Structures are given as C-alpha cells and as structure tokens.
Amino acid sequence: TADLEDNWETLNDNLKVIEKADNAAQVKDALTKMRAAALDAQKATPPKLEDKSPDSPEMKDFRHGFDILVGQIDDALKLANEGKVKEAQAAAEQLKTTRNAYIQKYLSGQCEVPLVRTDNPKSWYEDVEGCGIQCQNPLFTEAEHQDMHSYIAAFGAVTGLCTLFTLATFVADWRNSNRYPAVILFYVNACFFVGSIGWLAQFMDGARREIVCRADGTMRLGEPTSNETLSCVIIFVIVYYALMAGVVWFVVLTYAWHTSFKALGKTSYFHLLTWSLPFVLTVAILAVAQVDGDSVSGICFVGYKNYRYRAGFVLAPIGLVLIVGGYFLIRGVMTLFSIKSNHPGLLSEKAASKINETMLRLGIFGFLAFGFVLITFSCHFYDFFNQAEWERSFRDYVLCQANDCEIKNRPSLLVEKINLFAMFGTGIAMSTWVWTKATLLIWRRTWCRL
Template identity: 60%
Template sequence: MVLIHIGLFFGFVSILRYTSATNCLKNLTSGTSCVAMTTTSCLGASVSFTHTYLGFANDSSTLAEVDEKLTLWSGLKAAPKCWEVIQPFLCSVYLPKCDNVAGKVEYPSKEMCEKTRDPCSIVAHINGWPWFLECEQSHFLDNCVEHTYEDDVSFNKTGQCNSPLVRTDNQQSWYEEVEGCGIQCQNPLFTEAEHDQVHTFIAVFGSFCIICTLFTILTFLIDWKNANKYPALILFFINICFFLGSIGWMAQFSGDARTDIVCKADGTIRKGEPGSGETASCVVVFIMVYYFLMAGVVWFVMLAYAWHLTFKALGTPKDALANKTSYFHIASWSIPLVLTIVCIAVSEVDGDSLSGICFVGAFNNAYRGGFVLAPIGLVLVVGLFFLCLVLRTLIKLKKDTPEYISLKASAKIKETIIRLGIFTVLAFTFVLITFSVHLYIFTNEQSWQDSFKQYLYCEANVTVTKTVSNTTTLTCSMSNRPSVAAYMIHIFAFFGAGISMSSWSWTKASLLSWERFFRKIFRKPSNKPIKLKKHKIIAKAFEKRKEINNGRLSISFASTHDDPLGMKFDLNSMSSQNSMSSDFRAAMPKLVRRRGGMFHPTAGTLRRYSDSDVGSVASKMASRRQSLDSQISACAGQLPWRLMLTEVDVLVGGQDVAVITLKGVVPPLTGIELAMEKNSMEAVSITSYSHQNSLDAATLPEPPKHLQTNFAIFTASAYMGEMQSKLQNIESTDKSEIEEPPPEAS
C-alpha cells in the first residue's frame, strides 16, 4: 500500500512538471522575420530546418557575421569539456530554428545556458560572457519541453587541447579552467633544449658523486677493523646515504624510466602520488632521494656532535662516545623515516620533468617548506653550532698547550682545523644555495604561472585567428620564465654535498689502505714496517688481564694504521714513540707480574717468584750466546713451557697475520702476537715482523744479551738472512719435543 502511494506521488509530480513545461516556440516579434539559411549546418553539425532568426545575438546582423563569430567561438575546442556543452547553446542563440510559415522562432533554453557556466569558466576569466549570452536575459526560457539542438542535432563533441596541454579525463590533472586538458609531462616553463642541458648536468655530477661516495664506502670496507670506529664511521653512513640518493637521481637514465617516473599514462605530469593508480616508480624514486637525503643531513648533526665530544676528550683515557652510538642510529634512521611516511600519507609527492625525479611539494610550497627547508635549516643551525665548538676546542688546544703536545700532533691539529673549516664553509654554502633557490622560486612562481596562462590564451586565439585568416605567421611566447641556471645550481647542492662528504677519505691513510689491499690481492711485498706503540701494548694486555687465570693470555693487535679520515693522533709526544727502549723491555716483566696490575693472581697462589728463581734461569742462559736459536732451545728445554707454534688467518691492513709455524713463515707477516703462558713460571713471547713476504727487515730491537727476569723476550734480529737460516733449522727440530697448542690458542 505504501509503495502504491509513493508511485502515485511521483506520477503526480511528473504530471505537474510536464504541465508547467514551456514550449520553446514563440511568435516572432513585430518587425522581424525568419531568414533563409545559406548553409544547413552549425559548427559542423547538420540541421534539418532551412530558416533561422538573427535577433538573439546582437554582435551579428548577417549570416556571414554569424559564421565568423561561430568560427571564433570554435576556439573553445581547446577546452574539451566546455566544447561538449557549448555547441548546442551557441547554435540555439546564433542560428535558432525559425518556422517561416507559422511565424514562430525557437527560443534558447535557460537550462542549456546554465549548463555551460562551470565547464566554460575560462570564458568568464578571459573576456567575460557577452550580455546576450548571460542566462538572466529574457530570451532564455525555463523548462523547455524539448529543443531542436539538444534532441535532433548531433554535434562532434571531441575537443582538442592546444600544446602544451594534453587531453585527459582525469579531473585531478585538469589545468585550472581548461576542463578536459592537463599540462603535458614536460614542464612547459622550460624548453626541450633546457631539459636536455639539465639532464646532462645530472648525469655528469650524479656519476661523479656515485664514484666518490662508492670510493669512500669501499675504503672503509677494505680496512674495516681500522675504520670501524666512531666518529669516522659516521662518515661511512653519510656516504652510504648520498650514494643511494644519487642512485635515485640516476634511475631516470635507465631506458624510458624518466617517462615512467614523472609522467602518467595520459601524458600529464604526476601529482599527488601515491593515489593516482599509476606505477610505483615515482614513489620508489622519491623514497630513494628524500629518505636518504634527510638521513644524510641528520647524520651530519651526529657527526658534528661526535667530533665535539671526541676532541673535547682529547688527552683523557675515557671514551667520549661510549653508549651513545646506538642513539645516533635511532635518530638518524627513524626521523627521516617518519618524514617520508608522512609525505606519502598526505599524497604530496609530485613529478618533475626537469630534474627527472619525484619529490615532495613540487606544486605545493607549504609542503616543500615544511618537509625540506625546515629540517635542513634546523640541521644547519645545530650542525654548525657543534662544528664551531669543535674548531674552538682545537684552536684552544693548539694555542694553550704547545709544550705538552708533540710536533706531529700539533701539525695534525692544524691540518684538522683547516679541514674542518673548509667543511663548515662548504656545508653552509650548500644549505645557503638551497634556501636561496627556493626563495627565488617562491617569490617568482606566481608571475611565471601568470605568464604561462597568458601564453595558453594566446595559443587559443592564434589557433582561431589562423583558421579565420588562413595565416601561419602568428606565434606566442612566454614573457617571464624561470632561470634554468638557478635550478642547476640547486641540483648541484645535493651532489656537491655528497662529494664533500666523500672528500674526507681523500687522505694518505686511504691510499695506504688501498696499497695494502692491492698488495695482498696480487701478493706483492711491502717495505713499510708496522711501528708499535708500547702504551697500546700495555693497554691491550691490561684489558684482558683476567684471562691469565685460565692459563694463557693471547693478545693480537689489529693494527696501528690510521683510519681513512687520517684524524688519529696522540697528544703526548712520549706516547708517540714507535719503539720500545731497553729500559721499557727491562721493566715490562715486573709490570706484567705485579699483583693485580696486568692480571689477577691465581686463586690460592700467594707465592711470588723471587730473584733467585729468575737468577737460576738467568745463570743457565747467561753462559750461552743469546742468539735466536739458543733462546728458543733454552726456553723449551729448561722452563715448564713449550714453544707455541700458532697460525692465524692472513688479513690485510695490519690485521692478525700468520706467525712462525713448523713449516716456516707464512707471508705476508704483519702485526704482532703477544702470548703469555702461565705455569710454574710465566713467559712472554713478543714476535713482530714487518708486513712483507720475506724476513729481510725486522722492526723491533734485537733480544737482550742477558736474561734479567723470569720472562724471555724473543724479537726478530735485524740480520734477517741469518734468521731465515735459523727458521729452516726449526723445521728439522724433533717434533716430539714440540707440543702443539690447544685449538683455542690459535
């Protein structure tokens, strides 16, 4: 029953609507008449009537003028959505149907007029609607039942967008009032030649940045044990960030990747990604460039802060960065991640044909300022603050304590001050470039857009004028365009920052690392000995002093090589000495044996070895020539200790290397092996070799002539020819007298 009432209600409404409808045919006013048509078409559409009326359009009084005006209006083909609805409207005004027999004319429909207002808003913005085409005029009738041009005439509604606009049905891509057209993918503010120029610029400096950052990354990797230390390691992560960011820039040069990255399938520029339903290449490139750019600048702050703590703690035994490095990673990787996720969530990733990448806020200055300029500006302030503190610390150190630091350390401090000063200036310059270019863009962007709009209007008028006058000499140009040089400088700021970060590894220490690496690869000997510092030996032994209770303490010094930055230096000139004096060798056993000094005494053992113990051993060895073979045989025969013959993996860069084995010496010999064997008596064997294939140049002093303590110190002789023959004798030694070490001693 309810459904019946609803049906009756809508039927009644329809009847009322039909009865209130107006017949569009009205009698001609006095003094007017129908005019015979010279053509049977309007805007290319065929009509069935033969007479028309010229009283509605007051800008034309003849059919020739009507034809000319309609040709001018045909310029709206460049606005496809407008062209679809305005054709029947214009024809109903300029060429209405007129019944010459009945003396009646078909008035235009007001609904038809109002239908053109939104799609054809470009008309109102350019010159405005003529008064006779305003929907409030009396010749537009409401509620026409039917109209000839709407019901009986078929128009070609296909529009054509004028370059640089392209046809698209995606409403988000429409250019302002030109519905149905969007801006082409290639930025019309720049010429094709300028696009090629910028792409070449990116290819050159992007490749150079990749090469430089990759060199730094590999320099760290080939000498990882030396380079794996903060704050130098922070530059490793910064270079990784700029390397991956540069990969994102260079992705556009892979085939037709640039078109896929910055363009939609309909030929318009990408806007508001993700969410357009296109491929993910734009978002992937955005993440590569934006995330690693932000990570790099946050790591820059961590680097400046780490340098500040490190240089402030120079001359002190504490580790200034202890328990802080994990926070460096949390901040440097999570903050950029949050910014990247927010940019993607608000769909503010846009393509840019000039740079060939997708970035945040290409068409929205507010997002560009909030997600790019604000973080970089904050980084600049904080980073430069810590860099200034670092420079102040180093300058004060060099100026106030010249008598307490060595000449070598003083020279390195001066070098570091210069390098940090240049680095600070470069960092400030690159950020200043970024802000300057964005300020230039923000202040001039509106004038560029206005110039582009006038260019589009000019192109539309020229198209119509060429059609009317049949001429091809008219051209249009933009009066105000951005400078391509400013954009190139802005792009260089990214690659320049990456190159400057890589330049920290352009040091002699890096070259030496590569030299050692290639010598290992090609099995070439090196003539540069490793120089050991005694304070490092003591520190390393003290660090593992508790292990002596297990019966053996084995210490391997990875290297004394500098890190790739070349910023290791000791302030104390005495600590910088590279050899052990005879006094140090004499005092070394007492230092190691001192109760609780180097290692804790064995539980339940209170006896200390007296001078008689030492003298007993010394008297037995004093009568013998203390050559290398006599020391080895005496120690093996008279002490409750057996010669340990170990073999360690051969590595590069001063790492743990092979030592004497039953088969001789395994080249290349580098580093040192400090082994302590504790039983009824202790013995320390310090064996050091130059890192080379042969034993032709020993670096440590000769063994002492007399044994003064309960330790036998064995060192390589400077006469390596003699030593090689002695090592050959070791091979022939009765293996039954030599005890193999346990597996854990290796």
C-alpha cells in the first residue's frame, strides 16, 4: 500500500521512539507501527530487482530478512507487553543488526552490483567502504550456476552411493576383507565417500548459502574468520582432507602393487603414514586462513581468492603423488618384465592363482587411478597457469561497476567439469573393486543373518 522508501523511514522513525521511550506503551506502539511497515515493505519489490522473478533467490532473501525482522519485532512486543522497557529496547537494538546485515543491501544506491551494502568492515571489498562482494560469483550467470549444481548433484550422488556400497560390503566381511592389500581400496573408497558428502551438503535446503555466504550476504573469503558460522571450514575440511587422503592412499595402492611381487596380517600403524600428510596441510590452510566459499562449486575450498594457495596445497601435492605413484607403477612393470623373462614359470604355474588374481587387479586399479589423478592434476594446472589473470579480470570488472563493464577473461567451467569427472570417476572406478562374484556371496551371507 505504501512505498518501500516510506516503510524504511517508518522503521527508522519508530526505532528512534523505542530508544528514547520511558514507558512500554510508547515502545508497544512504535513496535506495532514497525511490524506494519516491515510487512508492507516485504510486499514491495526493491528498485534493483524490478527485472527479477518474485521466486528468484534475491527476492526470496529480501522477503526472508523481513521474516527474521517480524519475529524479532514480535519477541520485542512480548517483552514490552511484560512491562520490560529496558529489555524491549535491547531487543529493538538487534533490529538494526538484522536490517543492516540482511535487508539494507536491497535498499542502498551506495553499492552497485556485484558489490553489496553491509556495515561489516571485515566484509568490505578492498578500500570500498560500506560495500562487499556479493555471495553469487559475479563472473557466472544463474544458468551456469544451476547447470554446474545439476552436474555436481548427479556425479556426487552416483559416487556417494557406489562408494557407500563398497564400504558396506567391506564392513559386512570386515573379518575376511580387512587384509592388505585389499583394505587399501576400503580407505580409498572411504575418502571419496566423505568427499562426496562434502560436495553434496549444498543440496540440503538453504545449505549452499549457509556454506558459501557470510551472514551479511557477502562471499566467504579468508576463512577461518571471526563471528562467522563453522559451515564453511567444515565443508572445506571434509572436501580437502578427503581429496588429499585419497591421493595419499593412491600412493599406497601403487606401492602395494610394486611390492606384491617380492612377497608372492600386515594391519599395523600404516594409518600414521597415510592420515598425517593431509592433516598437516589442512591445519596449515586453517592457520593461514585461505579458505574461501564459491557459489558455482557450492563448496568451501583453498585458494579460490588467491590461486597460489590452490597451487601450493592442491596442485603441488597431487603433482608429487603422480611422480611417486608413477615411480612405483614403472618399477612394478619393470619387476613384472623381470619375473616374466628371468622366471617364465611363475605366471605359468596355477599353484599361486590367488597371487596372480590380486596382483593383476591391484595393477589395473593402480594405473586407472593414476590416469584420473593425472586428469585432475591437468585441470588444477590450467587453473594455476590462468588464475592470476582471472583475479585481475575479476577485480577490474568489480571496480568499474563502481566507477559498459566487460569481463576480459574468466575461469573455464568445462575444465572444472573435466576435473570433477576425473575426481568423482576415481571414486566410482575404485568402488568397482568389490564388483566381483565373491561379494554377491557376502551380501547373500548378510541376508541369511536374520
């Protein structure tokens, strides 16, 4: 009925009355007028969002900020009706916080897209006071975000269910399956399963915004931070630790294949050699606070803002597992070449058929993992080689939108999809370790246990 600008001024005016009021009747009346102006403001469409759908995320977030505000006005009203003026004034002072962190960005004029109005100085973009970078990655369209989300949902669900089956198959036969070198594939699978949970957490109701955005709607950058939720650092820890634990268990896989010949139980502190390196690296990223959120990937990761951190903590360790894993695979084929030439009557003897089965299967999984890890490496390499320029194009676009503006260059979502194909694909390929006639018997034995 009334204009949004007037409704906003009614909120300002009545807030002044509450703080300089001596009685709860003046507070009650000011809050009642605020509740009316908040609800009517909720019905209005911000001037910036006239081209936007009423069911669009910007409009839904706009309306949500007033839902929080109306609840807080109602909380202040039960206090005022209790004759608690001091407490009602205190609750009313919290309306300023909500108005400024959630709604203000839709009533500004001070900031221009992709910048967003926020009173939080820790959220401000470089030297621009009062404005922070919007949570939604400004270099990619809503259509490119949604296409990417459907892509992660699909690949993430498939990897999650495949790896979960392999884990369930292993624990069902844990007495007979927890034996080296077979149990290496159990931990490889656990790594990609936990990793998938990390990638899939964004698909829960309102989870992507909780993970990737700051409470004031700006993008999560340089986490761990003060007065922000733990959702970002949790997703990063799940994704990054599982990713790094996965490439380390891959080296163990190549090592097991390289030593499967010298040999033809063994469950000791092997875990110390595998879980330590991703722990130290994860802890190092948390101490240097280079954890950032991203709306298109829907996760929190390292080196999204500053590419060097992705190069140091993702590219370089994966490059080292490739050269170490590659070494054990080459040495493994040389030993296979040696045993085939020097002793032709080893693979030509049926006496050790169980040795021939496990060694051939180990090598297949070892080389398959290597190929996918090499694709994963190449995509992080393209990103390392080009993100300095992309960061400059990001900053240049964001800045002339304040003072037509073009995006010179941007990250490639295709390269990201290839990386995810190879990353989730390792998880799906490694899960086929349990896709044998022997596991059909394990689930039959599990069914006959009731």
